[PDB]
Paper text:
Shigella causing dysentery utilizes the type 3-secretion system (T3SS) to inject virulence factors into the gut cells. The T3SS needle complex is a syringe-shaped nanomachine consisting of two membrane-embedded ring systems that sheath a central export apparatus and a hollow needle-like structure through which the virulence factors are transported. The T3SS structural core is a membrane-embedded transporter called needle complex, which is an evolutionary conserved syringe-like multiprotein assembly with a molecular weight of about 3.5 MDa. This complex is made of a basal body and a hollow needle that extends from the bacterial surface. The basal body is assembled by the stepwise incorporation of multiple copies of inner- (MxiG and MxiJ in Shigella) and outer- (MxiD in Shigella, which belongs to the family of the secretins) membrane proteins to form their respective rings in the corresponding membranes and periplasm.
The C1 map of the needle complex shows distinct tubular densities at the resolution of 5–6 Å in both the export apparatus and the inner rod and needle, suggesting the presence of α-helices. We used the recently published cryo-EM structure of the isolated export apparatus core from the Salmonella flagellar system as templates for modeling the structures of the Shigella proteins SpaP, SpaQ and SpaR. Random search followed by rigid body and flexible fitting allowed us to place five subunits of SpaP and SpaQ, respectively, and one of SpaR into our C1 map. Five helically arranged SpaP-SpaQ dimers build a turn terminated on the top by one SpaR, which has been suggested to resemble the fusion between SpaP and SpaQ. Analysis of the helical parameters indicates a helix pitch of 19.8 Å and 5.8 subunits per turn, similar to the parameters reported for the Salmonella flagellar complex and for the Shigella needle filament. We found evidence in our map for a 5:5:1 stoichiometry of the export apparatus proteins SpaP:SpaQ:SpaR of the Shigella T3SS. Comparison of our structure with the isolated export apparatus showed different conformation at the inner rod interface, where the N-terminal helix of a SpaP subunit occludes the opening in the isolated export apparatus, while it is bent and moved aside in the needle complex. We built a model for the inner rod fitting in our map a few turns of the published Shigella needle structure obtained by solid state NMR and EM. The inner rod has the same right-handed helical architecture as the needle with eleven subunits per two turns. We modeled the eleven subunits forming the first two turns as alanine polypeptide with helix-turn-helix conformation In vivo cross-linking studies in Salmonella have shown that PrgJ (MxiI orthologue, the inner rod subunit) interacts with SpaP and SpaR.
Numbering used by the authors:
A (entry chain f): 17 to 256
B (entry chain a), C (entry chain b), D (entry chain c), E (entry chain e), F (entry chain d): 6 to 213
G (entry chain g), H (entry chain h): 1 to 86
I (entry chain k): 1 to 19, 63 to 86
J (entry chain i): 1 to 35, 47 to 86
K (entry chain j): 1 to 27, 46 to 86
Amino acid sequence: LNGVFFRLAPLFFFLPFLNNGIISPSIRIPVIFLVASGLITSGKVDIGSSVFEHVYFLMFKEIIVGLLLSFCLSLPFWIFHAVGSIIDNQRGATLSSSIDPANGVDTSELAKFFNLFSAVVFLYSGGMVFILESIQLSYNICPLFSQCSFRISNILTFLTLLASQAVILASPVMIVLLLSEVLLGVLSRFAPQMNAFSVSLTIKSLLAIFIIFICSSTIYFSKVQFFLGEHKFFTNLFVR
Amino acid sequence: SLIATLSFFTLLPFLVAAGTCYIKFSIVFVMVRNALGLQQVPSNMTLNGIALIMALFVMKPIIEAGYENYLNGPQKFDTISDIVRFSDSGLMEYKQYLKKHTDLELARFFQRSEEENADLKSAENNDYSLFSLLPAYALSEIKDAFKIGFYLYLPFVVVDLVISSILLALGMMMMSPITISVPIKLVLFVALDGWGILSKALIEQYIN
Amino acid sequence: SLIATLSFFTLLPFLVAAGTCYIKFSIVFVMVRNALGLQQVPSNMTLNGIALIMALFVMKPIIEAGYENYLNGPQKFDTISDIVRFSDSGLMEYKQYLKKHTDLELARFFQRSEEENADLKSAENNDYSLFSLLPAYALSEIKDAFKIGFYLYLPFVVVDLVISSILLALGMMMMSPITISVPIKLVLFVALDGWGILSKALIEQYIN
Amino acid sequence: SLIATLSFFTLLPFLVAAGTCYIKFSIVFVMVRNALGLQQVPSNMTLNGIALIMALFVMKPIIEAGYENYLNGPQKFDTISDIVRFSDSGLMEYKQYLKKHTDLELARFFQRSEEENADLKSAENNDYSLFSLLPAYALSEIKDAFKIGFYLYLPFVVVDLVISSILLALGMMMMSPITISVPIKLVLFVALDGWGILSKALIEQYIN
Amino acid sequence: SLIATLSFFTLLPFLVAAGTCYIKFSIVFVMVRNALGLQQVPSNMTLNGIALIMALFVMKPIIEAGYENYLNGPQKFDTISDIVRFSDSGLMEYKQYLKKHTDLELARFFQRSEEENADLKSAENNDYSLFSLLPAYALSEIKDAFKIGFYLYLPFVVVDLVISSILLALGMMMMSPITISVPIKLVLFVALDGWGILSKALIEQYIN
Amino acid sequence: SLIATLSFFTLLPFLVAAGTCYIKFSIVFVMVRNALGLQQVPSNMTLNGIALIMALFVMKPIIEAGYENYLNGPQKFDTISDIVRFSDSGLMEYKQYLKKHTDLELARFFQRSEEENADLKSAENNDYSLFSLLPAYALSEIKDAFKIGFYLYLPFVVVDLVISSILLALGMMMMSPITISVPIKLVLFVALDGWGILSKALIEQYIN
Amino acid sequence: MSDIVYMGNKALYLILIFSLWPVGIATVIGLSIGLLQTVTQLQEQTLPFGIKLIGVSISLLLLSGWYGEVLLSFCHEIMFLIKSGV
Amino acid sequence: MSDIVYMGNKALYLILIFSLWPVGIATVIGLSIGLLQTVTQLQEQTLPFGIKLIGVSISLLLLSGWYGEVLLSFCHEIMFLIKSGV
Amino acid sequence: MSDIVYMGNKALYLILIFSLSGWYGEVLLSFCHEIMFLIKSGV
Amino acid sequence: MSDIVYMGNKALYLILIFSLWPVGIATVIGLSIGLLPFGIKLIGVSISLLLLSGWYGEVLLSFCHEIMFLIKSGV
Amino acid sequence: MSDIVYMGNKALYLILIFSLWPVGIATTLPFGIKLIGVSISLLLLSGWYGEVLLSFCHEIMFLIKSGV
């Protein structure tokens, strides 16, 4: 039963912002035995198991499987993270661009609310459900044996539409904020004594928040679209 | 099969803490502690104890059905029957609970995952065994708990954004606004009586 | 039936550390430590140890009531009777304490939660069992300790704001003012006699 | 009755590390690491190891007193008497040290806290029990160590102000002076013999 | 001799992640993230994740050699001895790799600095033990990764220079040009399809 | 008396990592990483790993002294005698090493620290006991390592200041010159063959 | 889905209110003083910042009470719809 | 919640006083010299900063002690009302 | 140090080419691609 | 409280002298030229950090040593 | 202090050299032409400039082992 255990435990830990370190490690371990004691059944094989279990090589294969989904499934959240990130770049966060202060504080500014919104939004249709369905599809495709990783090598080398969907979301945001910065420059040209920190920062911050409102709504609809896109990508990658 | 009962007395309350309750309470308390700055509560003692107390608190009625029918007899001075109907009826109560809060979607999808239920074609959720009942229940509870926790998170992150906004407006490029956020949040957490009301919310209209 | 006394002894210091005190002191001290910059104390050594010492320190008078009535006899060299009135009277003292600092609102909310309380017909607050008494008390102490700590928090945040104001006023945008904050904060922390007044305040006018 | 001696020995070095020294040295070293930029030392290795070494080092006189009177005998090769005067006399040595460096304010406030002290009417500081003595000493040592560390702090902040003022007098607003401070600070830290003098200052005229 | 093999298995993957790969990819992607303004990617989730994924992928062929001669062999259907020659031959493959990419300069300095090789007078690079082999190889990978990383760095710095030139030429002296850099870089980062070229190149024209 | 040797073996590698080497290498590598901008390396993986390898790596000649006198027999396949001359002779080698690199000033100040040393008045540095030897050596190694690291530091900060001077001489007041500094530093870091000379210099002129 | 969107809209609106007022105050301060950094120009570097600080402090003096009230209402409402959030 | 509002108002007023005096001195100095960076302009970059330093230094010399006194009072009160803050 | 000189030569020549606005940005696109090519000529 | 204030006054006076000299040099330069100039200013300021440094550092050096001494009596 | 002082003097002098040449290179229209000059600096000066730092920096680390 261990094999499915180390297909699922990679799944659970590798996929943290669905099931993360907020959850106590004593609650992240039992879900493995749970979902496996579900899944493993009907695979009743009684044969002679190697000395030292040479099928440990098979173990290798299984680990990779779980990891794949997680980082690929991380694309959706991250595109939202990237959106939030770039916006606060023009507002406040990018002032950590300098040599290493104390920690990544300005990560917490904006993108974390996007992470919460996106993670909640799964739970209308499904949080961990579609992931597990695709994983059962992989069980159908590759249950187990010596032939461990068919084409995983070229499956790994791939393209993800991170900034593509980020732009799909934030195009007018970025263009208008660029124009506003150029308006700040026109303000400087009007009077050469502006010392932008005396002027600009407040304006770009307020504008960023307003645009985040309207783009949160557009985010809802673009989110359902993005979910469909990533579903197609995963189907392709696991079948190949 | 008395051995199994007592060795599970040694082991199982952990699996139970992963079994019906103890998930959402601990989760929500960690959500509460991830705001307000640091841990600010002892991770190893306080919140876990609270979760255990509140969880046995929750489950007193299912254990009550068992106390009438199961618990009173396995008092080891009675040398009670091996646990067939004790298990079955306590499981009936546990089943009614689990199905109070288990999604059908997860039920069918994990039934397909097992390859046992997909071939066996189970229709009643009481005909889903506890073995099959566990994982869909846990995941559905996870979804509900995450929903509740982030909806709880909302005002504190609002305060964080507010203070950061004032600072970035004033040119306060260098600051740890989190610390300024640290006090303000709890005012609401205390002044709206939201700790007691939240405990009540989860507690009662979880069971009902 | 000495068994349960010693097993529940092995269990109990955890429940006690979560049951009357030790919440508020650890809370307040981590709150003090989110000022001054870094941890600046060993989270794994010092402050929680201080919390333990002050914990037993504070609980000593309830233990004195039990020392007259309970503790003196279970000294195993006295061969004491089975625990009937030891539990009853120590519970009476613990009850008076818990109800010194428990909200009735939480009492009734967990009464509805348990459904033990609804069927068992609980009228007096001494008729609410200790198990029912525990989590409500924990909630209320959480509220009180939290409020105290964040009302302590605010001034150091004020000082941080002042330092950043001065720096950006002269235009030193690029700075980590926190470090220049570190010394000044200390002076007040020391100049107020503030940790001594904090310990004395919590200690004396927690118990009284 | 060797049991308690060896069990409390297994327990005790933590309470000792919170009991006489180990506070001040770790505090000062963290203050030093708050300058110079990063941690610059492994918090999980170096400063705590140094703290332990220098701690046992500095306690070697108190340990010498307990070594002649207490420690040499419980070496199981002497088959020493049951611990009556070992505890009392080691407590007397710890008492003399503690009263070297404990405030009376803390003593009286914590005496009102225990409420055993109020009823027992303790007048001499040697009549204050060790358990009562410990946390007052801890708080007093905290205050003294804090005062020392921030009086250490002041000059480096002076240097940072100097570097900024020079740059901004030239108008080089866009700079991270911290990094330019990074080398200069160490120079003084080493050039003043400040590492060795700090260690010797704390060490020799801590105990004397 | 299962014991030590399995203990060093519990220990070793960290030293391996510091032993062949995992340096250069992490440094590359961090240099990538130091342009574009903020991190713009999760420091704590994705990028070093990709580093690990590419690392295991890239180390697959050594495991293929050890798959033919070791990882096929432990089977009961192969009737294998305990791990004597499996380790030796896998180490021979690892040796051929490490000596693909280790310097002789670092090797001799590290030989005499261990003084095991200095006094023992080792001649073949296969007679240099794996422990002595690791850190020099790591250093050489560091230097190559740094060359590639800063030669990655140049373009966005050129873009920033251009933006500053524009602003100062038009009299827009007061601006934070970094923000204007953020979108254009992003556009270019996609508009040339360069991330996939970088990743595909790193993987393939590393291993092939 | 095998117990203490093996328990302290479980305990000791930490205290050794704080006891002879492992300080200067890690410190210097962190100094290297505070140049070039960001962390530029994995803090939790690479640099301290290199430090451990280089650490025992470097400690090997003392272990060769023991290999003749100590090490050969505690290979538990030799069934060696109780540790009389193992400790004495390894301590003598450690003594000669520590006295290679311990200052007398620290020795006398910490001797007055221990106050058994002040009462006992030790004159020879071989008459200072091992525990007495440890912390003075720690302090001396701290001073040497810090000197080395910040002397490494100086040129990159020079480069930063010079690029700022260029931009401000051209009137380009608004810039984050650090990023343009990022490539240039690396080339010096390589163009000198300088890391190899650093490692070799640490290497031989540490031990010789 | 829909309820989550309602949550996000309401949250961002509350943020808009509280974060809106002081940042607009700071905007007006900086723009006005920069316009006074014109005729009788008088530019050193930073000066307008000082008034900025004053403004924001006055902001927290002027608005405070009802500001708190806002959160209270919504916060209570949140817990209410907690029982319809499942 | 009324008490919370009173708390915030008090703290912010103390901020007002403490941050009011020194930056007011600096403002006076910079305004005077910047007005002297007009007619007989002679405006290079930084000059008034030097005189600024004098005033600022004297402020941190003269003001400091009693300034801390302000916080002293309020801080003491908090601890007292800690017992009524429960 | 000479290789850095050549890289800066190309980049600063492009800066000269730049310093009309819109299509000017397009110029950067081209060179950016070429940069990554000679990325594998940096080692 | 008073003694701590006296300590801070000493530190601020040392700050005063160190920050007094170079800005006076720059003041002279800027007045004269204002009656381009940044370049001359650069020279002076640069030379200051070269020219004055040693004995200026010495100031801090001396006082810092004294501090550590009375560190022992700060208890 | 002795070696410290020597190190500081030498570093500040190297700073002087590098920060001195670019304005000698430099010796609103003409501003644009001036820009070319600074760029040509990194074209013209860099290599031997680095050599300067290179030399001293190498020696530093060497005499690092004798700087203790």
